[PDB]
């Protein structure tokens, strides 16, 4: 007990060296595995029931998982770096008092573009991706809520709607986008842009930065309205066997030197205030990472949709198959 840790997380987030460092420091073996979406993570936790000590839901999955008895309370007294978290990302209605989730990574989705291949001024909004000239060229995120977010935004509906008529209208709108779609990728989304398989599509800010670090000219065009904002938080599954190890890993990732060093490698913003303050000006004011104020004001954080989540999934699965 607590000699190992079963950690299930998003791809891109933890460099291999970081896990080696954790094991070096604690003597705790990490059995690490990754996922590309909340929907894949969730389906896995439902099938297995137990088997994981840590999982990383986006904030729009936290309330659902708590209500379904899938999570357990996190002890803040075991997290010496809880004080380092930015208060602006804490104590939200999805998890009052952060009893079930700890802010870990926040990011945004815009339009990824290869500037050596295509023109920046030719795209300003999500709806521009529907243009006929993009036939068989786009990458979309492999994420039901993000893909529906862009169509709902295009239609002038809330990207967090629970209205089945609006969800169906977004599905019909997305069917018109499908001739422009080459791939759906949320696993290693920087890789199609790096390989030149795609020059345009949806892209996370972190993924675009990683592509730039490898020498590719991958920028982010921030849609004028409807830019997606999201946050991933760490949670402890209800059946966790290694609770002490789980808190040790959360605290290790909250450690400002770790959160800052990792942010510089993966290209994502951090909700750890102390770590954010350690970031160089070049990273902190990178326009493809941190959206301008107008983009923030006209964008939307991904929020829970309650039982309508099944409807988003059903239609997104239909889009991917047909
Ligand atoms: N590797 C980046 C993970 C982003 N997870 C949150 C996605 C929310 N739609």
């Amino acid at each position: 007990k607590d000699q190992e840790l079963y950690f299930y997380n998003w791809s891109e987030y933890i460099p291999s060296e970081v896990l080696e460092d954790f094991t070096k420091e604690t003597g705790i073996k990490v059995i690490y595995s990754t996922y590309e979406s909340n929907e894949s993570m969730y389906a896995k936790l439902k099938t297995q029931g137990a088997g994981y000590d840590l999982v990383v839901p986006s904030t729009y999955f936290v309330s659902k998982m708590r209500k379904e008895g899938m999570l357990q309370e996190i002890d803040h007294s075991k997290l010496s770096h809880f004080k380092d978290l930015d208060p602006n990302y804490l104590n939200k209605p999805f998890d009052p008092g952060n009893k079930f989730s700890i802010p870990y990574i926040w990011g945004a989705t815009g339009i990824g573009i290869n500037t050596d291949m295509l023109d920046k001024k030719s795209l300003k909004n999500w709806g521009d991706l529907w243009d006929a000239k993009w036939a068989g060229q786009l990458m979309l995120m492999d994420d039901a809520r993000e893909v529906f977010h862009i169509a709902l935004s295009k239609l002038g509906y809330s990207p967090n709607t629970t209205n089945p008529k609006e969800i169906k209208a977004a599905y019909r709108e997305l069917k018109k986008l499908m001739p422009n779609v080459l791939v759906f990728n949320s696993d290693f989304p920087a890789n199609p842009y790096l390989a030149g398989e795609v020059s345009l599509g949806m892209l996370w800010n972190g993924s675009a930065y990683m592509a730039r670090q490898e020498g590719a000219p991958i920028q982010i065009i921030w849609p004028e309205k409807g830019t997606i904002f999201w946050m991933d938080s760490i949670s402890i599954p209800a059946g966790a066997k290694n609770i002490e190890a789980a808190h040790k890993m959360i605290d290790f990732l909250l450690r400002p030197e770790n959160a800052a060093k990792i942010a510089l490698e993966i290209g994502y913003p951090t909700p750890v205030k102390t770590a954010h303050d350690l970031l160089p000006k070049e990273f902190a004011n990178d326009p493809s990472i941190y959206p301008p104020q107008s983009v923030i004001d006209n964008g939307e954080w991904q929020d829970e949709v309650g039982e309508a989540s099944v409807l988003y999934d059903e239609y997104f699965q239909k889009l991917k198959v047909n």
Side-chain angles (χ1 to χ4, degrees):
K1 191 176 68 98
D2 288 300
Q3 305 309 309
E4 68 195 359
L5 177 77
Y6 288 83
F7 189 180
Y8 197 33
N9 192 10
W10 296 84
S11 55
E12 303 183 316
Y13 284 174
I14 305 176
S16 56
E17 304 82 4
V18 171
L19 296 174
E20 287 165 16
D21 288 354
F22 174 81
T23 298
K24 202 122 203 288
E25 186 184 300
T26 66
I28 304 163
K29 175 179 178 183
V30 184
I31 301 92
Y32 195 72
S33 53
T34 62
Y35 50 81
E36 80 293 358
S37 66
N38 287 288
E39 298 73 19
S40 288
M41 174 271 292
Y42 176 93
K44 184 73 136 282
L45 264 64
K46 281 291 191 213
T47 305
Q48 305 307 123
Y52 301 107
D53 298 309
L54 288 175
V55 70
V56 184
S58 295
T59 66
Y60 61 95
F61 258 66
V62 172
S63 190
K64 169 180 171 58
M65 296 177 80
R66 180 196 61 76
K67 288 180 189 183
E68 292 173 6
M70 296 176 78
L71 306 176
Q72 66 178 273
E73 172 183 28
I74 302 172
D75 190 347
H76 296 187
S77 77
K78 295 185 186 283
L79 310 176
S80 68
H81 298 289
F82 186 87
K83 65 174 191 292
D84 294 300
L85 284 157
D86 187 327
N88 294 145
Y89 296 90
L90 296 174
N91 192 32
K92 304 298 183 182
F94 70 83
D95 183 24
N98 290 88
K99 290 184 206 195
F100 293 89
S101 68
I102 304 298
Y104 166 46
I105 299 288
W106 79 260
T109 317
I111 295 165
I113 190 167
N114 179 318
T115 60
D116 283 355
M117 298 297 278
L118 298 173
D119 305 320
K120 190 118 172 169
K121 86 269 270 296
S122 65
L123 297 106
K124 296 192 276 188
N125 285 287
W126 290 125
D128 298 330
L129 297 177
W130 270 252
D131 289 356
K133 67 169 157 173
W134 306 127
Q137 286 164 69
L138 309 173
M139 185 195 92
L140 296 189
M141 305 316 295
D142 189 3
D143 189 300
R145 296 295 312 291
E146 290 202 28
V147 173
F148 271 77
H149 182 128
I150 79 162
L152 287 162
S153 185
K154 186 190 189 285
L155 296 170
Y157 298 142
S158 170
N160 299 310
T161 192
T162 64
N163 185 327
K165 191 158 155 76
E166 294 178 2
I167 298 164
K168 182 184 214 183
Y171 168 66
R172 293 191 309 267
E173 204 62 19
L174 286 163
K175 291 226 300 279
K176 293 188 271 178
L177 182 62
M178 291 308 104
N180 294 356
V181 182
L182 183 65
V183 287
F184 291 94
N185 191 333
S186 277
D187 206 330
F188 32 77
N191 291 186
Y193 289 88
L194 277 160
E197 291 157 352
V198 302
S199 288
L200 193 72
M202 296 176 72
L203 196 55
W204 288 321
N205 53 351
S207 309
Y209 171 91
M210 286 184 277
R212 293 193 297 277
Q213 291 302 108
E214 298 294 331
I218 315 307
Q219 302 303 335
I220 297 290
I221 293 165
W222 292 114
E224 288 181 333
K225 72 171 159 71
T227 290
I228 316 176
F229 288 87
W230 46 259
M231 178 169 83
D232 287 328
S233 295
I234 305 163
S235 297
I236 302 172
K241 296 281 170 72
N242 308 295
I243 297 161
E244 294 312 294
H247 288 83
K248 280 178 184 172
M249 176 59 82
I250 296 164
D251 210 33
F252 177 85
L253 295 167
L254 290 181
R255 187 183 299 157
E257 59 180 37
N258 287 337
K261 170 182 73 185
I262 297 164
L264 285 174
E265 230 193 287
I266 71 171
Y268 287 101
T270 175
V272 181
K273 183 176 182 281
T274 314
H276 177 78
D277 295 340
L278 291 170
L279 299 172
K281 224 217 109 293
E282 145 156 52
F283 186 97
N285 301 121
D286 183 341
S288 284
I289 302 173
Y290 294 91
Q293 190 68 45
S294 58
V295 171
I296 294 169
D297 294 346
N298 295 308
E300 277 103 0
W301 284 90
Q302 298 201 273
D303 197 16
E304 66 87 32
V305 291
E307 302 98 320
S309 62
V310 185
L311 210 55
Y312 282 96
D313 279 355
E314 180 202 313
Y315 290 127
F316 184 61
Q317 289 313 123
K318 279 183 174 117
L319 282 171
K320 293 206 290 172
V321 173
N322 312 347

